Nucleic acid binder design. Structure first.
Ligand SMILES: C[C@@H]1CCO[C@H]2Cn3cc(C(=O)NCc4ccc(F)cc4F)c(=O)c(O)c3C(=O)N12
Ligand SMILES: C[C@@H]1CCO[C@H]2Cn3cc(C(=O)NCc4ccc(F)cc4F)c(=O)c(O)c3C(=O)N12
Ligand SMILES: [Mg+2]
Ligand SMILES: [Mg+2]
Ligand SMILES: [Zn+2]
Ligand SMILES: [Zn+2]
Lengths: 47, 261, 66, 242, 261, 47, 242, 66
DNA sequence: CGGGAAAATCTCTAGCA
DNA sequence: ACTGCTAGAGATTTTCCCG
DNA sequence: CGGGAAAATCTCTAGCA
DNA sequence: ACTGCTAGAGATTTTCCCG
């Protein structure tokens, strides 16, 4: 599995770790506390 | 390094040192220090350094709203050519956006629109209009203008040309249409040294022509190719290589270890 | 018949990008076109490109210029 | 190169146009153009038509590309010169409009429309439009029940006419037809530009008299002398500008 | 092209076409079209695409003020090493800036400060303080943060570390000093894989040592060099080349065509 | 001589032509209507 | 490399330290360190001193680097533990502070100061300070007329003492002295780090018994066997980790 | 005497940039230091660098490491 | 002289507001 | 007459290490 | 095959707000 | 499951042109 830390939406504070669902070129689909988010890969770190 | 690792984690809880500092100050290997950093949630503060690439298919348009002189301008760009469509509208309302998008669909083969998540673009009127015209709506990741950087850069270009020709008109709508004309037919460059109008005509004519010719070729050229497998469909052959499509997976193999039937 | 059509396909030029490369690559020759992929030939090298990453045009200037 | 004599014979036999020789015999378009222009016995994309139609007390301004039947129409608030000029300036910004045919109406002879056409580089000139208007009215009546306001039904009818209704020889819609026509015009303009660029040179070969240049190839130079086309190697001829 | 040029200037007054469009549409050479564009004041809207380089001398400090949690933080960075100095101050006042800069001058060899044109940094108290300490003030081009991008990037780094360690302190001043400590001694990297404290100590010790050794060498090594000219001073010789200083102009010439006296 | 067009200070509109006085690496000193300005070379075009 | 015997003779004759052999005989610091540590007969940058001084009804907190005489002083609003902890945390953020000597005052034995020292990794321990305080007071009295407030005169005196007053053997100021001392400490720490990194290896040469590694050069390997230093080619020896 | 001092000068390492190049170049060897210029030797190539564009250090790690 | 692994180097971004 | 930079995350290239 | 000039290509930035 | 880009200004490299 993977850990994802992300900056989501107009909020400078980084959040995570979240579960990685889908990794595309440029964006990742994650799950954070039963919430599915789509983040650009610029604003995410996957471990 | 059991003692060193403990003295590095204890220090990291206080200072959040980067991997180099702990590697140097506790004789840790780079992998061990990097592991110590990677397991600290307080130090996960930077995304990876690249950019995505927008969809550039011949049917996608990027739409956005921009503001000039207190008025609202709705702008659409055909991504593949740079051809733009702009119009001053009374307010950022789903009705105005729906009318504009119905116009664009009636003028050009618009298959998909990619916009941000503004209220006018997510309205039920716009969704009903796109459904009637058979337009697929793609919405950007919220608060990521890079997802539609093409229409954003076009907003910059349009505003620059409007500033250039604002004196020649009295109203903003006239100057906006003048800037649209200038961008579409009076500015050359790009892939073909074209104007945006010439490039869009080339792109769409090419799509029609290539579709027809490929249809004819596939109708005539019917063969099965065995390589290394199953009866792969033949796409292209020659120059010592064969291009095949096996189970909807296009791969390229050399002419050797392959036979065409 | 078929050879004429194949020549007309190969008369088109494709501009394309790679997944991690932001500069558009030069006009490769078109070999095959599909719903989501195109097969090209760029400098004696055959690649398969997603349709969303390729711009296909017949550059009229050049055509009219031999 | 080697097929120039074949192209000449083909033109003498069938009077084919330069497009045909260029596509078939693998010749540059300039050489085929000179071949087709060397015989005396062998001797639209910019024209739009504007008209105003009234429907349910509202004025609809219709523009028809004459060569293709493609339409651009919209409901305008009033039959005034300002609205006509705005519509024409939009159309010129979307399509290569060279000249517009009009019916000597009040809104078309206004000074605002004339100024807009002057800025846009359009020439104003004062049967297809009537048939197209009737077809547009029929489609509007067909799809009126699907739109509350008349302008939306007008745009829906424009979409249907341009991309859904098909007809003619090859069964293409008006949008495909206008795209093909504009692409052909672009090719024609590119060829004219190349001919203008190369017509200012004079070539001396083997030294013989000056000859008009046709094609400066990578391995040969194609020239014309005494109403005849000859191929000479590049190293055997010199090209100068006059 | 006399007719073509006139038809291109007349079009440019209307559309402001780029050079490619007029070259294509009027058969103009690229130089002629570029000249037509360059003579239009309405089309001069873009600067050249590069960046300058800040002064990195061992004596220059870049100072700035930043804001966090409603408080004001005065920050100074030693440009050559990345070593920072930060302190929470009650207000952006020339008195606070003067006291801070007097402190910095009393702690490190501060020869020149480079700041923006904020009111506190242009105050007469700060000018009097810099005069007493022998500090040269360089002010940036107004509204160009790139002139002091070093201290701007340091503001970003300091705020990130403050966010990392804010919980460990109760007040902002304590966390700011903790972040200063962390940046100076707990983060390695850069030219020498150093911390900022180690790098600043290395830089200043190197400057002192090199100055002394060069003074001794110039006192001992006294020669005049003739090349190609006048009696040029000898700076360095060897490896087939000679470095000389003629009329305060340092140039490098090969050992050939040169004689040392 | 040279013509300089520049963006000066928080004003998006470009100004000029001005007289070039000094061209350094990164900045230029100009004269515009008896006013001497120092502009970064990012924000200036010299003809 | 070839000068190892010369360095050994020099140490046996003059008891020189590894810095001298490294600078003179062109040896890596590890080899010279082993040479200087091989003889039994041949056998400060972090210590600061804190004191509180009262001047004109205001409390001045003075920190003196013991090894150099460099000072850091400032006027604090009150003689409290919080202000002392803030001052010490600032000092540790500016200089490598390892341990501070104090006079068992109320503000130094506070829990806040102890917590700050714990976070900073400083050790608290409870004649130079008195002389330095007198010198600081003299300079403050000298330059008081040039400053309205006492804190500004204090900082001016600190500047004068650190960078203008000079004295000692080579006539350097306190700032140059502290910079030299900290640079020497950094070199010492780097050498200790390298020694710790390389002391975990064992080398077999020509196979002979295990030998402690000294330097892994580009063209040779320096080892120690039976209290003797030998140079062997890299291809003639193997290095393993234990 | 003089040779010792020259060797100590050449023991220092210089990091520097060029006028139009934003990435810092590697540790060249110091040959001469002046008020506004430094003379270095980067990969068998001698350059003169403005003092404002050069960072001069004796990297202690490396020194202590031979 | 040959692969693997480790290390070094290079490329690239956000935030500084 | 003055001037973008920094540090961290991934990708790619060099170097070292044992054969 | 050799320089110059012209053209093409590459590198890099602001603004999109 | 989605995704920075564009056009203009300078600098540098290729190509063409006559010898
Ligand atoms: C009232 C004074 C006087 C005049 O100017 C204003 C406004 N200003 C603006 C920034 C700022 O916009 N930083 C963002 C940024 C953008 C680009 C870049 F390369 C580096 C960057 F940091 C400052 O830092 C700053 O100190 C000021 C300031 O002080 N003042
Ligand atoms: C209220 C809706 C919904 C949600 O988001 C807001 C705010 N917003 C902000 C920008 C913008 O910040 N452009 C500057 C920029 C920055 C980076 C880049 F790569 C490209 C760029 F254009 C827009 O263009 C835009 O349309 C909106 C918008 O519409 N909305
Ligand atoms: Mg936008
Ligand atoms: Mg700032
Ligand atoms: Zn951490
Ligand atoms: Zn213009």
């Amino acid at each position: 599995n993977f850990r994802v830390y992300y900056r989501d939406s107009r909020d400078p504070v980084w959040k995570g770790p979240a579960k990685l669902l889908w990794k595309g070129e440029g964006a990742v689909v994650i799950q954070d506390n039963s919430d599915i988010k789509v983040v650009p890969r610029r604003k995410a770190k996957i471990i | 390094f059991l003692d060193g690792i403990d003295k590095a984690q204890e220090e990291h809880e206080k200072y959040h040192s980067n991997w180099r500092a702990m590697a140097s100050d506790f004789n840790l290997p780079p992998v061990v220090a990097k592991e110590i950093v990677a397991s600290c949630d307080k130090c996960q503060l930077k995304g990876e350094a690249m950019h995505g690439q927008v969809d550039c298919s011949p049917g996608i348009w990027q739409l956005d709203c921009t503001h000039l002189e207190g008025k609202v301008i709705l702008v659409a760009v055909h991504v593949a050519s740079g051809y733009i469509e702009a119009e001053v509208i009374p307010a950022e309302t789903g009705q105005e956006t729906a009318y504009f998008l119905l116009k664009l669909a009636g003028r050009w083969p618009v298959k998909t629109v990619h916009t941000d998540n503004g209220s006018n673009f997510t309205s039920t009127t716009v969704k009903a209009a796109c459904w009637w015209a058979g337009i697929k709506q793609k919405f950007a990741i919220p608060y990521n203008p890079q997802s539609k950087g093409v229409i954003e850069s076009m907003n910059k270009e349009l505003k620059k040309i409007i500033g250039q020709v604002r004196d020649q008109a009295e109203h903003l709508k006239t100057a906006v249409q003048m800037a649209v004309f200038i961008h579409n037919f009076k500015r050359k460059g790009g892939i073909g040294g074209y104007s945006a109008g010439e490039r869009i005509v080339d792109i769409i004519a090419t799509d029609i022509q290539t579709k027809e010719l490929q249809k004819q070729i596939t109708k005539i050229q019917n063969f099965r190719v065995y390589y290394r497998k199953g009866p792969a469909k033949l796409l292209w052959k020659g120059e010592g290589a064969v291009v095949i499509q096996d189970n909807s997976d296009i791969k390229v193999v050399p002419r050797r270890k392959a036979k065409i039937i | 018949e078929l050879q004429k059509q194949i020549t007309k396909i190969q008369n088109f030029r494709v501009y394309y990008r790679d997944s991690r490369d932001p500069v558009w690559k030069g006009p490769a020759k078109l070999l095959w076109k599909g719903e989501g992929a195109v097969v090209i030939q760029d400098n004696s090298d055959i690649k398969v490109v997603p349709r969303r990453k390729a711009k296909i045009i017949r550059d009229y200037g050049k055509q009219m210029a031999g």
